[PDB]
Amino acid sequence: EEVTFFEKAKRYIGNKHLYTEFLKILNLYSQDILDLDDLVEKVDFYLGSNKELFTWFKNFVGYQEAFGPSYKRLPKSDTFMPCSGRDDMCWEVLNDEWVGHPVWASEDSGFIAHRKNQYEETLFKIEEERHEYDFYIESNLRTIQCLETIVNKSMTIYKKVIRKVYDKERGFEIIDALHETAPVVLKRLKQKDEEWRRAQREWNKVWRELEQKVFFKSLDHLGLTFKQADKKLLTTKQLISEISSIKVDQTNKKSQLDFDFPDKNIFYDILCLADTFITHTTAYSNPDKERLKDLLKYFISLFFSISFEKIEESSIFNLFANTNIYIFFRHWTTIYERLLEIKQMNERVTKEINTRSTVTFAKDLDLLSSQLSEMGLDFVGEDAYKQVLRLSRRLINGDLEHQWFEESLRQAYNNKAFKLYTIDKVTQSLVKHAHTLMTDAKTAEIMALFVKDRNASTTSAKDQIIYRLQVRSHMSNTENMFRIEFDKRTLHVSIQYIALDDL
Amino acid sequence: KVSVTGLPLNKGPSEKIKRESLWNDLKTFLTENMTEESNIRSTIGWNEDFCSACNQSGSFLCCDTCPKSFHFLCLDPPIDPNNLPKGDWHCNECKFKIFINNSMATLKKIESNFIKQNNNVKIFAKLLFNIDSHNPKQFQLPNYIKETFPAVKTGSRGQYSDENDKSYNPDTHIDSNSGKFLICYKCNQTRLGSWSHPENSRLIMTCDYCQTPWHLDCVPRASFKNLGSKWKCPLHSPTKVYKKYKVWKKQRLINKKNQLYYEPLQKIGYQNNGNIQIINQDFKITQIDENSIKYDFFDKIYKSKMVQKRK
Amino acid sequence: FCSACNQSGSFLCCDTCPKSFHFLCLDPPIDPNNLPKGDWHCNECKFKIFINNSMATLKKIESNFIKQNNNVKIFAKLLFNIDSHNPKQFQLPNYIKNSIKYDFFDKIYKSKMVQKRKLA
Amino acid sequence: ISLQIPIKLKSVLVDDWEYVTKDKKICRLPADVTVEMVLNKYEHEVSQELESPGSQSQLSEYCAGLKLYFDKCLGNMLLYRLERLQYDELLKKSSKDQKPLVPIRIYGAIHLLRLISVLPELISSTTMDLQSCQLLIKQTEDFLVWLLMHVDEYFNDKDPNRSDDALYVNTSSQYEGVALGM
Amino acid sequence: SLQIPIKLKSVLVDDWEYVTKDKKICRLPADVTVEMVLNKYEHEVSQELESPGSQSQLSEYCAGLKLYFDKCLGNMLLYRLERLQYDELLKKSSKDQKPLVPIRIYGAIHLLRLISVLPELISSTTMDLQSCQLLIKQTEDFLVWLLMHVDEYF
Amino acid sequence: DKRRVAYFYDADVGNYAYGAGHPMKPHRIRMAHSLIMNYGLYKKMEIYRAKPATKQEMCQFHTDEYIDFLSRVTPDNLEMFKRESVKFNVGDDCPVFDGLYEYCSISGGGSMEGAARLNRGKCDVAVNYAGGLHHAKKSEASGFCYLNDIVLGIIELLRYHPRVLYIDIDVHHGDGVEEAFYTTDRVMTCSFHKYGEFFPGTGELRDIGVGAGKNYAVNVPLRDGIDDATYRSVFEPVIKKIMEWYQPSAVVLQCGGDSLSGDRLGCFNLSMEGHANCVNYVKSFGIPMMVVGGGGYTMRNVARTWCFETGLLNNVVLDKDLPYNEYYEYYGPDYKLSVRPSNMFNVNTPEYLDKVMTNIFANLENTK
Ligand SMILES: [Zn+2]
Ligand SMILES: [Zn+2]
Ligand SMILES: [Zn+2]
Ligand SMILES: [Zn+2]
Ligand SMILES: [Zn+2]
Ligand SMILES: [Zn+2]
Ligand SMILES: [Zn+2]
């Protein structure tokens, strides 16, 4: 077995440029330039993912201070620098040789700063102005208090105060006179304090209204960029790439995608939103609207076997589909997962909103915003999930702006509901994909075969082969196929990516 | 005057800012009467913008007879800034040309220095005389040594440079040269994640030397490399070893004109350094071939086995 | 003068180089009556035209011969130079007066037999 | 003109360049082996071999001229910008004790190697004759061959973080800031 | 150079005297030829080597020595007074149309003179300083082994 | 636990300020006090004003030349110090303002007095938010820090305790403190920091120490967007293992607000509760502790976090409604005692943290 190790390693590595470096490392060991530890660590980096070959190699070769990358050693000449207050214990415990100095640790390049959005910059500017006003006012007030203590009966503060008040450069003479005029500086400083305080009141009002609109936008990171990323990443190519990547990872080591539906009211909510859009949209004729509603209701009632009567008034099964049906199902699952995520926090968020206390010292008295309360976008009562659904319906209709919808969601869910900012566009795309499922002959035939199989309810093993063969006959010979499996006992969906393995 | 608000600090409203930024258990005063002094410490009982020498920025001590400015340290002898010369200052060449440069009779002075040094050294007398008319200048390799190694380049400041100096984003997992997925060497997976669950994905690096891709969690590492040296995956030869100490360093790359190769006839046991090639006379690159490496490895293993089993 | 034993007798004169050899002091020996009936060259001056005219360039035939004779590689540089010298008498040195894997496995096999029998 | 330097010495010079301008290291001064010691050993080892006085006096003349040129040009052209501060410090240590600085007794064997690297340019920027240039180049090449022979005992490779007796030492932040910032 | 023992030098001088003064060329292929000696050497020495590299070196050296004794025998390893005999052998090899294998004709007297001028031949090459030492060491080891077995060979 | 708490505050510390646009402001110290007194925590704590440090006391760690330069430098005469500004990095990176030396002396005196009170047994918790400058190293200013008062406080602590633990939860690596005790086993430094192209540049997983101090320096390099549930899952096991194996006699905790969500420079996503959980966990061990407040550049958040942590040290949980301090207008729309995390993405996968913790636990085996 010792003779076949090299070809085993050659096959496992799978590249020539890496096998060359492996041979170079082995040669370096063979010339007494590498000890066994470095050889074993390098072969760990090469064949360590394999468990048998590495152990065999370690048992064959007989394997049986650590300086850091960010510290240098200075010469002892540059070590003894006079520290007058240093003692024997201080000399014993303090380190004088090894130095780190981030500049060396930066490779003489620099550092990357964290990106900040514009609302954070506005907040920083407001804070800076507040700090300047408060710093000047408090310094003047402290100097005033000290001056009153002097007149009536810790070094640079008063000097800088009277140097700021007197900018004529004559202030130094005033300090000298103060060391030898106290009422004069007293009455000057008190007037300065009064005018600065008035200006501070006006500026505090302005800053309050300015911050009170951008605060919640400042804490929204994934939401701001969201409604450009959803358009780019909710395409057919991205979903195909995801399922292909999962399949490739599985094959490098039948249930690629797994979905679990723990609630059925979300289906009615999605149907309601879709019907609202279909009624509102000026992009389909009158019969086409009814056809789209019928398709949506029939598909949801047949695939998930929910109901057929209450749905319009409010044994594993397999489906072999082309790209269109897969994309339609993926859009439906996206809507369902987003609504489920916003729904599972119903009780906590509802309790928070209802039991949201207010400060009585100055909040209720002076500093409040009825802006969201003037449009009913404050979620008081009006259970959060149902209110979100109602606002989504309003946005789909068009009588609600996107800005106020997003602001209400931000203030009601603490920026945890940023994924519903595109509910109208996702509903529109779902309706469009339902439409293309009608105006295509091949997809119509595939859907008819699915309906026949689903309604048969009693089929033998031949249902797995002849049905797939007929669907492929209605399909082309080059593009992918998807197998969607539905289980009623737990309402579980499994998606398998049969690109060309059926041929 | 002017504050950060852009106002004299006494105005306030700034009507334009108003329109832009609008829509349409006791107090601290008792802290001065409850702070006890704490003094129980155990230690309480005690013309050009560059330098004519190095061609770099910084503060300069300028000359007047010419537009040349030198650093304080870039001067022979160096001058401390606190102890300013405080007088008419020129560089060496200005002093020489003002005081000594009589071009009609300069050769006679050079010959006088030549014959004065003829007693001891006459091959360097001209060179010694040629040193007083030159200003200080930073040392640089004379442009025929750097070209010997076709991997060394000069930076903007003149420093040494080598060939090691350079939310949910799924497209980083795609080669973009063939459309395939970048498969991590350690785990054999791409771990692309999904837009539904972007926390199921793993960042990938695609090493800059051999183009192999790695995960930041497979090779222990926190961030990407963007500013420092080029990243090299752990699948490369050390090129520098400390053996218990003794230091081994791999030879630099020589231009192919002087890069001598040689193939030994021994091919079983041949003491070479890590300067091999798989298939002035101090930089030979032995060509070793794979079979010889196999035999060397097996020889070393078997010999060490005997060495240990003798005991 | 026969430039193989440095003696006198009946020689075989050359044309390009002024050298004379015996009919029997050659490798292979030639019958004295059996003339070449043409152009004859000794071991030298035949490799010279071989390497300067017919092949491409110098220092390339040696590499090809060494690569071809890689089985015996330590003697390759001697085997290449042996076919370039005229035969000479043996004067005293003046101070007296998948074919690779099979070899790999056989080497390991014999070496491990030696190991085991030496250990015990 | 043209100087034939062995390739290993070129590698040594490039290593020095990398150590100074990239790793921010300087030379451990005073050197264990200075320029004066290297030249004295070379002269004693070479003159003891040949016997012709005409070729023996030229060796002494070459060594003396090399020493003089190094002493006169080290402070001008043989130092990188980082090293100059160190140089200045030495001058101060020389000026406090009334002892003049003699650079051939402090620096050694790596500043001499970079001294005889710009000799072609220094010769080119003169009015020197032809056979004098030929003689200088021949002596320099002989010295370079001799130095290449004894290379391992003058240019060792030990890390400053491990050995206290290495050729190079690490600079501190307070040193580098003054050197490259003021 | 090569370290040839005194006894082997005496044997070479004895053969020189027995050929060039009292002409007594030995008989046509004897009982022990070069091939038998070399195979027995490679067989009896390989059983005391514990390294595969040494085994490969020994095998390569033996094969190269055989292939070099083939092309060097009639070139510069024969006295003048013997050449005619060689010639007749050649003629026999011409008549029978059987290839000539000089390893199995000459033996144990002509291999000794083969490793007697090798330093000269090596010096007239371009071999490196490291392989020539290996060749010298191998030849020295073979010379010592042959000196050990001298009474039964020659 | 019911510990006795000493609280150090100087009323002049807020009157010093950096440049106009500089992010670092001592004013937040004045703010956290105003909340603390208005919540009524002065009834549970002993409030002191430490005597400011002297030059000789500073020179126990720093050099005489650096301290002498700091006591003479002024915005007026900066042009007369051109060699010292580049020696000590007190030029553009770390500016020079009117109250540099008195501010440094106040911070150092507070830290040293807190350590002294811990030594004498007067209290079991010392709080000094003026301290916590963990970047200055003995001859130079770095990271807006001019005097390493943590080193002085630990030096004062080492006169009575064999082993001292130092814990840093700022986003930045504690380079000064780690460098000061890099070769000793008396002090064990542990830092949880963001490593990458970030300012301290240092803090790699293989910086365990040199010499006798080998394996007595722990670095946890983290990524952007870490939250409370992940930060505590990293923080609790590491600190627990350090406590069982190193067994310190006293602990210093640098509570820098740089790790809070919404910071100018920081890139973490910790809320107030996730930041105070570290303080609560360290307090739950029973050994003497000294809490210092280092970084933090959003005053309204760092002040609230410091007030909440001070309340937690007094075994109370403060109400979420602010008590109407002087700076009431700073505290946003709701005027609550809370810091809201953002929805930013967390790039700290469990595998990377698992590998980091495995490395740290392997190194920690040689400290007991
Ligand atoms: Zn300069
Ligand atoms: Zn000038
Ligand atoms: Zn991976
Ligand atoms: Zn690589
Ligand atoms: Zn003859
Ligand atoms: Zn001829
Ligand atoms: Zn910080």
Side-chain angles (χ1 to χ4, degrees), chain A residues 68 70-71 82 84 86 95 101-102 111-112 116 127-128 130 134-135 138 142 208 220-221 357 415, chain F residues 12 15 20 25 61 64 140 178-180 197-200 206-207 266 299 321 327-330 336 343:
Chain A
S70 44
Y71 279 92
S84 292
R86 223 173 228 194
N95 163 67
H101 205 87
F111 316 109
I112 294 164
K116 248 63 187 187
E127 191 209 28
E128 209 50 41
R130 279 208 164 113
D134 273 81
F135 166 77
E138 300 255 10
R142 200 181 198 46
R208 170 170 61 255
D220 201 1
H221 291 45
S357 159
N415 299 266
Chain F
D12 301 330
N15 293 266
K25 309 163 176 56
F61 171 64
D64 293 2
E140 41 151 314
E178 186 209 32
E179 192 203 61
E197 265 89 55
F198 215 37
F199 153 67
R206 284 152 14 213
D207 274 331
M299 306 188 270
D321 288 289
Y327 316 96
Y328 196 74
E329 298 292 316
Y330 282 70
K336 252 64 184 181
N343 53 10

Side-chain angles (χ1 to χ4, degrees), chain B residues 113 262 303:
Chain B
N113 204 47
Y262 168 82
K303 274 182 19 213

